[model samples]
Target: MNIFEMLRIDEGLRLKIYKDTEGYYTIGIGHLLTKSPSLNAAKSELDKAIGRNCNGVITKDEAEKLFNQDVDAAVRGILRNAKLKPVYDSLDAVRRCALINMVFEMGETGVAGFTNSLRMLQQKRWDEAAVNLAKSRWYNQTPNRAKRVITTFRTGTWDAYKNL
Candidate 1:
């Protein structure tokens, strides 16, 4: 099977627009609201990515293609941002994945806004970095996710909680 096929199965296929776990309108496999300026724009873009008119429908093949492109753009956004690259590169693979996931959840601009967290990460101060992550609104709103991210950043694993 091709990469698209694998991701299609892994991410699951959806033909209609639906809100994701974070309450963002998503459709056609893990597509998020952050991908576009507005919900209407996102819908239109999804249709375009699938090579079709906007009717809130998408094929598995199209979703796979869009997912692949989205992944690339997300990684490129992280790599190209001067403020984020150093922190991203300084992390171990697991911590890097956590950082990348943060970027994905918070967007490049959103993640960049965490100045203290980024600074701590760049300085290799793992404990302070995790503390910085916990002090954000993102942490207040999503403590469960924040816990895992903070743990991952501090220890390169999500095995235990540090109790913020």
Candidate 2:
């Protein structure tokens, strides 16, 4: 149920370049090549991370290192968002992690759009929060993962983590 392990599975590691569901060039868990200012920069960063002349191909250890960085970034990014902070602060550790995982999947902007869900979460209306997320376009996009997360939101337990 740890954020690191949860995201590592949710993001799904890859040692080489792959197009994400949104068609962004990504490698090493959820590291977005598209987020880099330029394609060469993206390749260069991955190469440097692996300490090799790679075109985004990386070692397993290199992938783990990048995953840690991305997960940390996601956590910090979530905390920095003004509206989500209170909800994030009011949560149990398990629920806090669920929000982190959502940010990892959809980024802060995406999760921010779930205003009602966040409100319900802060108020401890667990099922209401889960229902709000389940009704979203995000749920339709990644049914299995969204379902697992929604279950966590509903139960406030690590039961959903077992699905991983």
Candidate 3:
């Protein structure tokens, strides 16, 4: 699947401010307004959309743009820690999408914490990487999504995302 669709399989589009699973002032798709690298500019963007923001209201255009920016950030974060450019270059496009989707959900830091699995992925050791991925909180917490990604890693095909 494409990066946007795959990523959004785990996110919801909200136009107004709401507390995320962590109780922060979040808006749009998954924009953590109260977190680091804060989107201070968002207030104005929301204001422009809502004709003066009462809390936060993101129009579709604004929300879509925000999602795109988030995806780009995850990509940079993943590649920055790849150490060798060839490691990223070695991944297939389907696996690459899964990698970016993982980063989008778990954040750069969370995914990077999977040292062994990341190493396996970097080395193109599919079986080992898939097995290593199963041994984590991310796997148990979001079993369905995690399994889909892990299967993609194991199989190197887009088929895992076709149904789910």
Candidate 4:
């Protein structure tokens, strides 16, 4: 998949919020959640990740670029697994984005456990793919996102997240 689809998968495509991950606040695709210390320091920390930053808040443009970078990193790691790479390469962009988005939400290792889902995807069983994805606990945790992904898989369309 191209980098743009990955941009849609990030948490903050159009808004800003202090997101806590494992007790640490993260902004703009996993940038550091710092105490109100140094704008330069925060910018520096974000720079380490995305090569750009703003104080406490980021523009949608900046956030999108950050996600582009983040997804590049995520896909690099996800594709490192031998099993996921071929599947990733085999799918069309919509399906590829679904898989990459899954890895973005769950880790690569987390997604790897869905062997049945992966198998169905590889076999081009689109309906089965949606069912298998919905069968998991992950689906229970995030049904809206799951529905979007499932629809993308079933229809091969990028419009799944439009209403959501």
Candidate 5:
């Protein structure tokens, strides 16, 4: 099924998944893609192309520029309290749907590459999975996105990353 079909996705919501060279996959939520005109329009324009193929729309070079836009000093936030997991877990339906959606939206090759990386992690191959996941677009983030995720994740950290 196509991405929209697989997820039973509605028109108003914007969904996108991206992968990086290191095999990292980043699922971007809340894209500003909509007919509404406002500040969100600008955000939509900036984040609109993230779900495309690496070489498509935005080039790897462009992605690289966007990736470093927002990086948190603390990567340990997710490790601390399972805050991010809940968001991840809460989207169980979306998560499963996205796996299929990304493949169709991107390609089988990209999907296979990304799935293999995640499988390695599930198989307890942290190093390999981490490497691959890191390569994914989801793993790479724009400054704003990175900070948003980090802050949200850290809020979930046990006692919080800042407190810990």
Candidate 6:
């Protein structure tokens, strides 16, 4: 595959994955809710969600479940209750190879690194995904090669653009 395809941007999902010397990265264009009728409420909800997940109040699976519960509802009133739109229209590539590598180290994917990378992109574990991608071994042992997962949080989420 080519560079764009390798990055998972060949599709029109707005979220694209790529690998390079810096490691695996993604470009999250859509700003889930930068402005809207209930902007504060939406921000508050996101805060609670991320806080719960990062502050030891909730597990990743729990967070995912919660998100899945009201994903449609939660996303409502986001950016004026309109459909998903890209804020970082240009795109900012980050690294997920770190996560990719870690998973491989643990024997998650025995053969295909691409498989795990694709999976990580779907999960949107942007940073962790990069880590996993950066941990893969190449050429048996002596000629083994690896890369570090770098991340760049540009415009998209509140943490990226807003002061929430």
Model 1 segments beyond 4 Å from truth?
Answer: 1-15, 21-23, 33-42, 158-164
Candidate 2 deviant stretches above 4 angstroms: 35-52
Candidate 4 lDDT over residue span 48-114, tens digit each: 6555544456776777666666677778977798878988988987788878777876778888889
Sort order, lDDT high to low: 2, 3, 1, 4, 5, 6
TM value for model 6: 0.21
Q: Which candidate would rank higher by TM-score, 2 or 6?
A: 2
After superposition, the stretches of candidate 6 with alpha carbons farther than 4 Å from their true spots are 1-112, 138-164
Tens-digit lDDT track of model 2 for 1-164: 58887777777888888778766778988877676556677787667666778876888887888788877888899789998889899999888889988888788998888989998999999877887888988889888888888887889887877866
Candidate number of the best lDDT: 2
If both were scored by lDDT, which would come out higher, candidate 1 or candidate 4?
1
Top TM-score model: 2
lDDT of 3: 0.75
Which stretches of model 3 miss by more than 4 angstroms? 21-25, 35-54, 82-86
lDDT, candidate 3, residue 36? 37
CA lDDT scores, all candidates in order = 0.70, 0.82, 0.75, 0.70, 0.35, 0.31
lDDT of 3 by residue, 1-164 (tens): 58888766656788777666655567777776664333555455456544655456667777788898899988888778754234557798888887877777777777767778878888889999999999998888768878988998888897776775
Instruction: Judge candidate 2 at residue 161 and give its lDDT.
Output: 71
Worst 10 residues of 3 by lDDT: 35-44
- Backbone clashes, each candidate: 0, 0, 0, 0, 23, 25
lDDT of 5: 0.35
C-alpha TM-score for every candidate:
0.74, 0.87, 0.77, 0.70, 0.25, 0.21
lDDT of 1 by residue, 12-98 (tens): 567787766666678776677344446787677666666678577777677667677766676799999998888888777767767
- Which ten-residue region of model 5 has the weakest summed lDDT? 70-79
- Positional deviation of 2 in candidate 1, in angstroms? 17
Off by over 4 Å in 4: 1-10, 14-17, 20-24, 29-62, 162-164
Tell me the deviation in Å of residue 12 in model 5: 19
